[PDB]
Amino acid sequence: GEELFTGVVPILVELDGDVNGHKFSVRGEGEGDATNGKLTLKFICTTGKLPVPWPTLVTTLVLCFARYPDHMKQHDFFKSAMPEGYVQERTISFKDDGYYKTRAEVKFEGDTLVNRIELKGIDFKEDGNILGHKLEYNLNSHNAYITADKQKNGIKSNFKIRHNVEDGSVQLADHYQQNTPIGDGPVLLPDNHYLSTQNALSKDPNEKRDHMVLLEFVTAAGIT
């Protein structure tokens, strides 16, 4: 459980994706510090040009690194599933456009926390904001409420993500999410609470490949 996260942990992210038949792969490397709720990673599209904007993949590309304060450590489902891990599944519906469906496993493989994802995207517009590459390279802060899913011995959450469009409007992405443990040990089913998230997206001046440098802070709150 929580003892796996007392220091900095190396992270590996692997994604295989297919959006309107455009196949692509992403690999990410970095580290996570759950006491700061900090993540730092660099992602590379290993198959060439990424056919979707990098900010639409952030939520898909490790909530076990959220900073849970001490009065709330009994509600940290994500860390209590470790080392065996959990499955994280989402449908992400982009207003006036297509949707993603994602399945991931998050678990320890030795010293490394691994997020392995399959993503499918369906019914996108070739001239819309996603396949047309019309989103700003940023991602603003969002809050997501976590509720226990007693039936599946896990949690669920749904929340909207507001992507800035380059013409000054906003593109909504409606997230529904379901997490279930991989093992069968005891897990902490939480009271209702939320996670607050901030992101900073940048570029490596030396990196010639399509890529994203990412800093993220995730902190838990909402219980008193």
Which structural domain, as residue segments, surrounds residue 10? 2-221
Whole-angstrom distance, CA of residue 15 vs CA of residue 165: 25
Q: Which two tokens stand for residue 210?
A: 């399509």
Look up the CATH number of the domain holding residue 198: 2.40.155.10
Strands 170-181 and 99-109: unpaired
Beta-ladder partners of 24: 17
Which residue, among 23, 130, 115, 34, has the nearest Cα to 79 in the 3D structure?
Answer: 34
Elucidation technique: X-ray
DSSP, res 13: E
Whole-angstrom distance, CA of residue 142 vs CA of residue 159: 8
3-state percent helix, strand, coil for the chain, nearest multiple of 5? 10, 55, 40
Whole-angstrom distance, CA of residue 75 vs CA of residue 28: 28
Stated length of the chain = 224
Strands 8-19 and 112-122: parallel
Neighbour-count burial of 38, counting CB atoms closer than 10 A to its CB (0-12 exposed, 13-18 middle, 19+ buried) = middle
Whole-angstrom distance, CA of residue 163 vs CA of residue 171: 5
* Tally of domains within the chain: 1
Whole-angstrom distance, CA of residue 94 vs CA of residue 193: 25
